[PDB]
Scaffold this motif. Structure first.
Motif, PDB file in Angstrom:
ATOM      1  N   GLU A 100      41.639  49.343  41.191  1.00 29.16           N
ATOM      2  CA  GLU A 100      41.267  49.228  39.667  1.00 29.16           C
ATOM      3  C   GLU A 100      40.733  47.741  39.419  1.00 29.16           C
ATOM      4  O   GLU A 100      41.118  46.868  40.234  1.00 29.16           O
ATOM      5  N   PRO A 101      40.043  47.729  38.586  1.00 27.28           N
ATOM      6  CA  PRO A 101      39.774  46.347  38.208  1.00 27.28           C
ATOM      7  C   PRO A 101      40.677  45.574  37.752  1.00 27.28           C
ATOM      8  O   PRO A 101      41.916  45.812  37.673  1.00 27.28           O
ATOM      9  N   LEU A 102      40.633  44.273  37.652  1.00 28.55           N
ATOM     10  CA  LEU A 102      41.740  42.955  37.420  1.00 28.55           C
ATOM     11  C   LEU A 102      42.518  43.440  36.223  1.00 28.55           C
ATOM     12  O   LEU A 102      41.948  43.898  34.968  1.00 28.55           O
ATOM     13  N   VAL A 103      43.910  43.317  36.548  1.00 31.80           N
ATOM     14  CA  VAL A 103      44.821  43.932  35.416  1.00 31.80           C
ATOM     15  C   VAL A 103      44.571  43.076  34.193  1.00 31.80           C
ATOM     16  O   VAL A 103      44.807  43.727  33.159  1.00 31.80           O
ATOM     17  N   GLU A 104      44.302  41.648  34.445  1.00 33.48           N
ATOM     18  CA  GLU A 104      44.376  40.892  33.204  1.00 33.48           C
ATOM     19  C   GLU A 104      43.545  39.504  33.910  1.00 33.48           C
ATOM     20  O   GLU A 104      43.959  38.970  34.581  1.00 33.48           O
ATOM     21  N   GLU A 105      42.662  39.140  32.931  1.00 33.32           N
ATOM     22  CA  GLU A 105      42.113  37.841  33.333  1.00 33.32           C
ATOM     23  C   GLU A 105      42.820  36.818  32.688  1.00 33.32           C
ATOM     24  O   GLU A 105      43.538  36.890  31.525  1.00 33.32           O
ATOM     25  N   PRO A 106      43.182  35.755  33.774  1.00 33.41           N
ATOM     26  CA  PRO A 106      44.317  34.693  33.286  1.00 33.41           C
ATOM     27  C   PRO A 106      43.751  33.935  32.124  1.00 33.41           C
ATOM     28  O   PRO A 106      42.860  33.859  31.717  1.00 33.41           O
ATOM     29  N   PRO A 107      44.789  33.277  31.613  1.00 37.63           N
ATOM     30  CA  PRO A 107      44.543  32.291  30.551  1.00 37.63           C
ATOM     31  C   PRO A 107      43.315  31.176  30.815  1.00 37.63           C
ATOM     32  O   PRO A 107      42.987  31.049  31.882  1.00 37.63           O
ATOM     33  N   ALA A 108      42.800  30.614  29.869  1.00 40.49           N
ATOM     34  CA  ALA A 108      41.501  29.737  30.067  1.00 40.49           C
ATOM     35  C   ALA A 108      41.872  28.685  31.084  1.00 40.49           C
ATOM     36  O   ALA A 108      40.692  28.458  32.069  1.00 40.49           O
ATOM     37  N   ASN A 109      42.866  28.106  30.984  1.00 39.74           N
ATOM     38  CA  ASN A 109      43.036  26.754  31.869  1.00 39.74           C
ATOM     39  C   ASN A 109      44.277  26.877  32.740  1.00 39.74           C
ATOM     40  O   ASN A 109      44.994  25.920  33.027  1.00 39.74           O
ATOM     41  N   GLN A 110      44.718  28.213  33.180  1.00 33.58           N
ATOM     42  CA  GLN A 110      45.594  28.275  34.156  1.00 33.58           C
ATOM     43  C   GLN A 110      45.246  27.815  35.387  1.00 33.58           C
ATOM     44  O   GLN A 110      46.029  27.033  36.284  1.00 33.58           O
ATOM     45  N   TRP A 111      44.084  27.840  35.861  1.00 35.96           N
ATOM     46  CA  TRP A 111      43.386  27.131  37.138  1.00 35.96           C
ATOM     47  C   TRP A 111      42.840  26.006  36.757  1.00 35.96           C
ATOM     48  O   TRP A 111      43.056  25.375  35.419  1.00 35.96           O
ATOM     49  N   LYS A 112      41.672  25.501  37.439  1.00 37.38           N
ATOM     50  CA  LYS A 112      41.201  24.284  36.886  1.00 37.38           C
ATOM     51  C   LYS A 112      41.917  23.024  37.085  1.00 37.38           C
ATOM     52  O   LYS A 112      42.485  22.615  35.913  1.00 37.38           O
TER      53      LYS A 112
END
Ligand SMILES: CCCCCCCCCCCCCCCCCC(=O)OC[C@H](COP(=O)([O-])OCC[N+](C)(C)C)OC(=O)CCCCCCCCCCCCCCCCC
Ligand SMILES: CCCCCCCCCCC[C@H](O)CC(=O)SCCNC(=O)CCNC(=O)[C@H](O)C(C)(C)COP(=O)(O)O
Ligand code: SF4
Ligand code: SF4
Ligand code: SF4
Lengths: 115, 115, 209, 115, 176, 85, 155
Positions: A100-112
């Protein structure tokens, strides 16, 4: 087909006196469980590719030592041990089922991570 | 006489050493210096509850075996007899049953210490 | 060599790691959000928190991964993010001679499926994460403080927790027992702001907002 | 945004439920804890200190939070039950050695610049 | 390249079993252990007669700190605070002020010898070789306060161990 | 001897007497701790504990929730310990 | 003279004290490793009469070797309170003296002094095994200058 090794060296890993049939039956069970996986999953095609090479690989070579050398999986007893893990992985993969596709795109600046 | 004087002198000597032990070094004590030692941190409350060890079976057979050694103790004066054939047969007989008791005790778990 | 000081860089390892990164990404698109290979040939997999157990199980059990040793389990506290905690997994594959990094995210009030089922090594690592940071993990067998003293308040490694702490210790003779008091440093920790106001590395120049 | 998955409790009702028996598990052993640790303080001031600690955490109105203190109190109960905290750790709750900090503005102005 | 440490299978011939049985009953490996303890009894003990025979050190040894001074007499410290800035344990506190004559030195240079880790980073950072760790390591004291050195005690150390510190850096400056 | 509803009545009002933060005057069979005697939920936990220790047997949390008045304690203890009268 | 008799008697006791110190090892951190080197045959702590003995009921001096963490601080006090008390405490290393490297931590008490009275302080990180030998030698000197009987005779 190779003399029965006295020990596998690894503690707990008992020597399998009949390893050829064990690999064949487990590999058939691998493609069995992979049947319940629809085609679209990348898990099905990759695992089938790995096991189909391995299945036609174990049946071709009757000798244990050439099987171990050509399999590139250490001692034979590890090969049944890992093939068992691949079986359990595929079974529990059927529950979670990550096609199944990604359950939820993470917040904008969780990474980076330059702060 | 001679034996009791020696017994008396030993206990007076020991008791005098206790008396100078507890009186010559004066005491500056409190309730924390009398606390039971438990390698630092507080004891959980023990040292009088039933502490069941495992060698109870062999502890009690020692009492049985200690009676065997009592029975075969008079051997030095038993050899000074006119019928050593009977004395030899009986002396070995007690040893045999002592060996037999140990052997049967051995075979049925016995000396093994309970887990 | 023309680079006697610069550490040599391996491209073959970079290609192998990149190919495996795409391999894992296609296998479980349900949790794998982004994947990157660092300049010094290290692979990082960014999964969704719900995929903590399934992703680890795949890496542990798949014949083509066989990552069968949790090197360590730690988190980095970044207050500027919505989910400040960032749980990081480090796995090593003995069969294939490689290491992988699996990292999630978690706010203060959110439980993470304990990886004790997959890696029994995580058990004690889980307690440290909860004790140092406060991240609770569900289904953990014996989740409790591991490093901090008994009855300790707060979570030390949190960036908002002062270095010197809130409470010091002292033997008080009146009660004849070691007691706790508010902290009072003989010499305060002289903080040093030593960040040069000139840009260091233009490569990581974050674009302006 | 307004919805996030819970810890143990789905709303305040079951969260309050998990507080009650935690208070129950805290009421019962206080005389036992006092006996166990040779508390100088009597039983009575033990019971309300549990009550007061439970009382100060009353403004919480979030099911996820209440679960966190509930589980944290459970560990505190666990640490106390199996003699993991000693007398000093228990007496830490009773702030004895430190002088009472006055609450009137006049006294604070007299002692220092504390706002 | 690996080697099997414990994969020795004893022989089952009549000779080998008797030797193992002889080893069992007539304790031999225990006698071999005993026999070698006797060997060390007759050997030469390595104890050094402290304090008549102090241990062997090296010129790089890090011990009690001291501020040295130039051959003219004026101190070497010009209060650049490099030692304070690099001190891993923040055991150094420095306060400077313009001296009466011009060129200015520290008015407070305190080293917390109970907070010091004796890493030697101060003597590396110093651009004038002012603060050094002397060869002394026998400055144990009865009170905690006596450890907390200030400028005066450290300057006294510089005027006491100078005959030794000068030679040490004389033998080691080329390595640095 | 058997157990009767009066027996529950007297011992229940007995155990409420020892409760320090209760008033013997306004304490009644119909007295509602929230309403009449002005307690809190943590308080209400204390009585139902004093109930179960003095009565001996254990009363769970589910019944300690809505049980509020000495009538409810006497009615509920009656069925649990089989006092039908 | 009475004072002379009490003078010799005090010296006899003080000689018996300083010539037999039995440390109760509180091996905590890297300061303990260097102390064992003092027990190693290079310095041979045993040769000075001072020999390591466990069971603080049968020990005279504490040798605090390592950091003192707030969690274990009750243990230090408890094992200190259980010593038959002609007793002294030796602090090894900067950490035990006043915190040392971890002076500013949240869970390290700034010195073992805050828990127990401290005799001679041994500075170092770690103090070399020879430096500790000098420390124990200093305690022997301190025991030598004890006037317990003279004070009693002049009370
Ligand atoms: C064989 C041994 C031969 C030598 C023995 C000498 C006597 C040693 C006894 C133990 C030390 C105490 C002593 O001598 O006098 C007790 C006396 C008792 O009176 P004190 O008042 O001096 O005791 C010490 C002080 N208080 C009471 C506060 C603890 O103490 C001393 O001498 C110590 C000073
Ligand atoms: C023995 C020696 C040590 C002795 C000392 C021991 C002291 C520590 C003991 C452990 C304390 C424990 O951590 C406390 C915790 O987790 S949570 C406290 C209650 N906080 C909440 O439950 C939040 C929501 N608040 C409410 O629900 C209402 O405030 C109320 C509870 C009144 C019910 O209201 P209703 O009635 O509407
Ligand atoms: S040796 Fe001591 S004073 Fe010098 S930098 Fe290191 S910690 Fe600081
Ligand atoms: S590094 Fe040397 S010159 Fe600089 S402040 Fe320290 S002692 Fe003075
Ligand atoms: S003073 Fe140094 S050597 Fe001693 S315990 Fe502390 S860090 Fe370790």
């Amino acid at each position: 087909a190779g003399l029965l090794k006295k020990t596998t060296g690894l503690v707990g890993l008992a020597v399998c006196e009949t390893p050829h049939e064990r690999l064949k039956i487990l590999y058939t069970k691998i493609l069995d469980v992979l049947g319940q996986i629809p085609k679209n999953a990348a898990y099905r095609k990759y695992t089938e590719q790995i096991t189909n090479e391995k299945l036609g690989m174990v049946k071709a070579e009757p000798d244990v030592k050439k099987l171990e050398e050509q399999l590139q999986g250490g001692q034979i007893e590890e090969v049944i041990l890992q093939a068992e893990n691949e079986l359990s992985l595929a079974r529990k993969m059927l529950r979670w089922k990550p096609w199944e596709p990604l359950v939820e795109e993470p917040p904008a600046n969780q990474w980076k991570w330059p702060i | 006489m001679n034996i009791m004087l020696t017994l008396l002198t030993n206990v007076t000597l020991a008791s005098l050493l206790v008396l100078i032990a507890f009186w010559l070094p004066q005491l500056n004590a409190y309730s924390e210096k009398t606390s039971p030692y438990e390698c630092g941190f507080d004891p959980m409350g023990s040292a009088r509850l039933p502490f069941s060890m495992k060698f109870f079976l062999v502890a009690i057979t020692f009492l049985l075996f200690d009676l065997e050694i009592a029975l075969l103790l008079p051997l030095p004066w038993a050899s000074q007899t006119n019928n050593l054939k009977t004395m030899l047969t009986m002396a070995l007989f007690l040893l045999i049953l002592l060996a037999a008791s140990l052997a049967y005790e051995w075979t049925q778990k016995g000396l093994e210490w309970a887990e | 060599d023309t680079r006697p000081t610069i550490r040599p860089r391996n491209d073959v390892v970079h290609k192998q790691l990149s190919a495996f990164g795409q391999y894992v990404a296609e296998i479980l698109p349900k949790y794998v959000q982004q994947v990157q290979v660092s300049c010094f040939n290290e692979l990082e997999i960014f999964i969704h928190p719900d995929g903590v157990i399934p992703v680890l199980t795949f890496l542990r059990d798949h014949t083509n991964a066989q990552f069968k040793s949790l090197a360590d389990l730690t988190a980095v506290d970044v207050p500027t993010r919505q989910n400040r905690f960032e749980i990081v997994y480090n796995l090593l594959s003995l069969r294939f001679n490689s290491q992988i990094r699996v990292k999630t995210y978690t706010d203060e009030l959110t439980p993470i499926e304990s990886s004790v089922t997959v890696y029994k090594a995580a058990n004690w690592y889980e307690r440290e994460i909860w004790d140092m940071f406060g991240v609770f993990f569900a289904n953990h067998p014996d989740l409790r403080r591991i490093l901090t003293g008994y009855g300790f308040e707060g979570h030390p490694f949190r960036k908002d927790f002062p270095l010197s702490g809130y409470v010091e210790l002292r033997y008080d003779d009146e009660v004849k027992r070691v007691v706790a008091e508010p902290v009072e440093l003989a010499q305060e920790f002289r903080k040093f702001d030593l960040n040069s106001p000139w840009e260091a590395f233009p490569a990581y120049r974050q674009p302006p907002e | 945004g307004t919805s996030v998955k819970p810890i143990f409790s789905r709303d305040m009702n079951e969260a309050k439920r998990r507080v009650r028996e935690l208070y129950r598990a805290w009421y019962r052993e206080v005389p036992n804890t006092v006996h166990l640790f040779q508390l100088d303080i009597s039983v009575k001031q033990g019971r309300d200190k549990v009550r007061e600690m439970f009382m100060k955490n009353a403004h919480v109105t979030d099911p996820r939070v209440v679960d966190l203190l509930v589980i944290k109190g459970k560990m505190e109960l666990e640490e106390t039950i199996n003699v993991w905290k000693q007398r000093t750790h228990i007496m830490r709750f009773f702030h004895e050695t430190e002088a009472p900090r006055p609450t009137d503005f006049l006294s604070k102005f007299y002692v220092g610049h504390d706002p | 390249t690996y080697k099997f440490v414990n994969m020795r299978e004893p022989s089952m011939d009549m000779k080998s079993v008797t030797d193992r049985a002889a080893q069992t009953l007539l304790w031999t490996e225990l006698v071999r252990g005993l026999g070698m303890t006797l060997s060390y009894l007759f050997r030469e003990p390595a104890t050094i007669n402290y304090p008549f025979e102090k241990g062997p050190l090296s010129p790089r040894f890090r011990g009690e700190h001291a501020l040295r001074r130039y051959p003219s007499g004026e101190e070497r410290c010009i209060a650049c605070k490099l030692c304070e800035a690099v001190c891993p344990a923040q055991a150094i506190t420095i306060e400077a002020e313009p001296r009466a004559d011009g060129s200015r030195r520290t008015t407070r240079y305190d080293i917390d010898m109970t907070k010091c880790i004796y890493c030697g980073f101060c003597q590396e950072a110093c651009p004038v070789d002012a603060i050094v760790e002397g060869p002394n390591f026998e400055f144990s004291t009865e009170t905690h306060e006596e450890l907390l050195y200030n400028k005066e005690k450290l300057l006294n150390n510089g005027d006491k161990w100078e005959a030794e510190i000068a030679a040490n850096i004389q033998a080691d400056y080329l390595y640095r | 001897p058997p157990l009767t509803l009066e027996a529950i009545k007297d011992r229940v009002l007995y155990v409420l007497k020892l409760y320090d933060k209760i008033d013997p005057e306004k304490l009644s069979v119909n007295s509602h701790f929230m309403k009449d005697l002005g307690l809190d939920s943590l308080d209400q936990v204390e009585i139902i504990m004093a109930m179960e220790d003095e009565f001996g047997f254990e009363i769970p949390d589910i019944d300690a929730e809505k049980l509020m008045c000495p009538q409810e304690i006497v009615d509920y203890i009656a069925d649990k310990k089989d006092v039908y009268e | 003279r009475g004072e002379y008799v009490v003078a010799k008697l005090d010296d006899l006791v003080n000689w018996a004290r300083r010539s037999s110190l039995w440390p109760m090892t509180f091996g905590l951190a890297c300061c303990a490793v260097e102390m064992m080197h003092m027990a190693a045959p290079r310095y041979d702590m045993d040769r000075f009469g001072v020999v390591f003995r466990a069971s603080p009921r049968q020990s005279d001096v504490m040798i605090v070797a390592g950091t003192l963490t707030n969690k274990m601080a009750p243990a230090l006090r408890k094992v200190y309170d259980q010593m038959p008390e002609p007793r002294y405490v030796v602090s090894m290393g900067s950490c035990a003296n006043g915190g040392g490297y971890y002076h500013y931590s949240y869970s390290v008490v700034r010195g073992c002094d805050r828990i127990v009275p401290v005799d001679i302080y041994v500075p170092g990180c770690p103090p070399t095994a020879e430096a500790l030998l000098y420390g124990i030698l200093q305690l022997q000197r301190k025991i030598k200058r004890e006037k317990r009987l003279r004070i009693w005779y002049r009370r």
